[PDB]
């Protein structure tokens, strides 16, 4: 029943990192614990905020298991599959995490983001977003077209307001939302966004 | 009514070994004569049986018709390792696909559970027995299987040698859906199992 | 630096098969590269043929997928063309090429290129 | 997907000349550009709407927005004569703009 991951960690098997090769053919889990110095970690650079934290509360849960809160096709105004990176690569092309979404613009546009999810399970709710710190200038504008951006998220416990430091790295950052608690992402860009969560007891 | 086997593995019935519509339970013992008829490997075996003994139903579905592969042969794959009649065949559960006229395009196929059961479901790779035996098969010298589920992803490359098969199976929840992509040596599955605990 | 060199029949009766192979220099075919075929008709643009990963993964221009075949042989670190069923349409100047990914987002560049080898279509 | 430049462009010694490419939501993709001269293979001198390859004359360069990529050379010289080509990758192909004959005039 425990998931015990071989050659990932547990950041980079929640996030869904491509190159971690797992075989894992059961969908339910009592906990998840990570192999000490583990080969894959994030794929693409960048770094996991209360990490030990968030491993210690994995361990020590009896019931783990992953449901989609979010699917990638609701985001109608922006574009949810075409952000990707090599140095995520998957089956010798660029690809991305695979359990949130890089958010890019469509066409020369990226419109204002305001998303809520409410957590309608009766368990815990493991949800992980993060924010993307461009290269550069023109990165930003590459692939967000705003110049000045933000990401918004709200919880009843909890006010996060990010601006990106524009080397290129990425920001992941999660909570765990109490059920019937919901969760407001509001995002202008570099909103790496939640497709999948974790259900967790206790 | 709870299924119990004569002669016959799990691992062989569930595949559907020639040499072998409700159900309850089901009961291997002990040594089966016939276990896989072609030469290979169940992989995670003793884990599904533990599963399987746990489920208080069990049923057979079509999740992909033989009939819905243009591009590629699916009956023509036959073994004499595996006889039906007095002549070559395969496992009746899964397929074989083969090249068509020399040329074996890749596969991208999907398959999404909308039941509301969890539904396990197989798949193979075939380890040929040499060069020549590849690309008679699958025309294609280099190979690959990918398969993936919103909890599994798996990538097969296949050994060339003594040929083998090697058999996998997943749990695919409600609602979750497994992705194949192949350019050969894929055993693709036909039928899977709704299985309730 | 890598270099690459294509050969093949360069007469090929219509109905026929154009059949090439790239020998790889310099570098493998086994690396993080995609190893491309492009042609050109004499006296007008660039057309993409196909491309090719050592892993075996094809992608092919859709108005020649179904008469394309690429091909990787790391053994002689080459790898191949063969477009079947051939017409008038098909005389070009082939190319082989690398090609190499972005940073980020999709797509890539080709370089190096081939000299290139001219295949005429005529009886 | 199309990739539209136009036929030819025409410039003095030392002067600067845009060849444009043009094509669908192109700004959302990088672009790629190609030197080729009579009888030789492309010669890549702009990659990922900006950067210039080694070797390739700082007098390169490169830009995407909109609908459109350009490729400036400045203080053109009589080698800077060549078909030029730029390069792009929509859903699952790569595809070459239509190419542009520069002339520098003599």
């Known amino acids: 029943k425990p998931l015990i991951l071989r050659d990932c960690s547990v950041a980079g098997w929640l996030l869904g990192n491509p190159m971690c090769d797992e075989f894992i053919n059961v969908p339910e889990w009592s906990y998840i614990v990570e192999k000490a110095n583990p080969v894959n970690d994030l794929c693409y650079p960048g770094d996991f905020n209360d990490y030990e934290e968030l491993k210690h509360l994995l361990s020590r849960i009896n019931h783990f298991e992953k449901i989609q809160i979010i699917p990638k096709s609701s985001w109608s105004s922006h574009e949810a599959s075409l952000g990707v990176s090599s140095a995520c690569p998957y089956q010798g092309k660029s690809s991305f995490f695979r359990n949130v979404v890089w958010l890019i613009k469509k066409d020369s546009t990226y419109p204002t983001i305001k998303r809520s999810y409410n957590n309608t399970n009766q368990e815990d709710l493991l949800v992980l977003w993060g924010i993307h710190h461009p290269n550069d200038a023109a990165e930003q504008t590459k692939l967000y077209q705003n110049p000045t951006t933000y990401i918004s998220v709200g919880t009843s416990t909890l006010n996060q307001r990010l601006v990106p430091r524009i080397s290129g790295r990425m920001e992941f950052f999660w909570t765990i939302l109490k059920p019937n608690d919901a969760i407001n992402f509001e995002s202008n860009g570099n909103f790496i966004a939640p497709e999948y969560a974790y259900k967790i007891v206790k | 009514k709870p299924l119990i086997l004569r002669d016959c593995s799990v691992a062989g019935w569930l595949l559907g070994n020639p040499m072998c519509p409700e159900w309850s339970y089901i009961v291997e013992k002990a040594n089966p004569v016939n276990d896989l008829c072609y030469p290979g490997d169940f992989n995670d075996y003793e884990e599904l049986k533990h599963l399987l003994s746990r489920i208080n139903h069990f049923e057979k579905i079509q999740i992909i018709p033989k009939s819905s592969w243009s591009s590629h042969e699916a009956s023509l794959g036959v073994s004499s390792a595996c006889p039906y009649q007095g002549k070559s065949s395969f496992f009746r559960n899964v397929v074989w696909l083969i090249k068509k006229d020399s040329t074996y395009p890749t596969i991208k196929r999907s398959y999404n559970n909308t039941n509301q059961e969890d539904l396990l479901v197989l798949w193979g790779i075939h380890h040929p027995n040499d060069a020549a035996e590849q690309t008679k098969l699958y025309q294609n010298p280099t190979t690959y299987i990918s398969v993936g589920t919103s909890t599994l992803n798996q990538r097969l490359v296949p050994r060339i040698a003594s040929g083998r098969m090697e058999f996998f199976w997943t749990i695919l929840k409600p609602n979750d859906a497994i992705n194949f992509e192949s350019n050969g040596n894929f055993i693709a599955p036909e039928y899977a199992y709704k299985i309730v605990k | 630096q890598v270099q690459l060199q294509e050969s093949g029949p360069g007469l090929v009766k219509p109905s026929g098969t154009v059949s090439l192979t790239c020998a790889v220099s310099g570098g493998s075919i086994s690396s993080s590269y995609w190893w491309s075929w492009v042609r050109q008709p004499p006296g007008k643009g660039l057309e993409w043929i196909g491309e090719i990963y050592h892993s075996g993964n094809t992608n092919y221009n859709p108005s020649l997928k179904s008469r394309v075949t690429i091909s990787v042989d790391k053994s002689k670190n080459l790898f191949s063309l063969k477009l079947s069923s051939v017409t008038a349409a098909d005389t070009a100047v082939y190319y082989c090429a690398r090609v190499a990914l972005f940073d980020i987002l999709t797509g890539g560049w080709f370089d190096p290129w081939g000299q290139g080898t001219l295949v005429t279509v005529s009886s | 997907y199309e990739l539209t430049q136009p036929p030819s462009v025409s410039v003095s010694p030392g002067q600067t000349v845009n060849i444009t490419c043009s094509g669908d939501?192109?700004?959302?993709?990088?672009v790629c550009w190609y030197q080729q001269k009579p009888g030789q293979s492309p010669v890549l001198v702009i990659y990922?709407?900006?950067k210039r390859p080694s070797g390739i004359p700082e007098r390169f360069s490169g830009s995407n927005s909109g609908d459109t990529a350009t490729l400036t050379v400045s203080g053109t010289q009589a080698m800077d004569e060549a078909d030029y080509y730029c390069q792009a990758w929509d859903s699952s192909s790569f595809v070459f703009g239509t190419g542009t004959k520069v002339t520098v005039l003599g």
């Open positions: 939501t192109l700004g959302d993709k990088y």
């Open positions: 990922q709407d900006t």
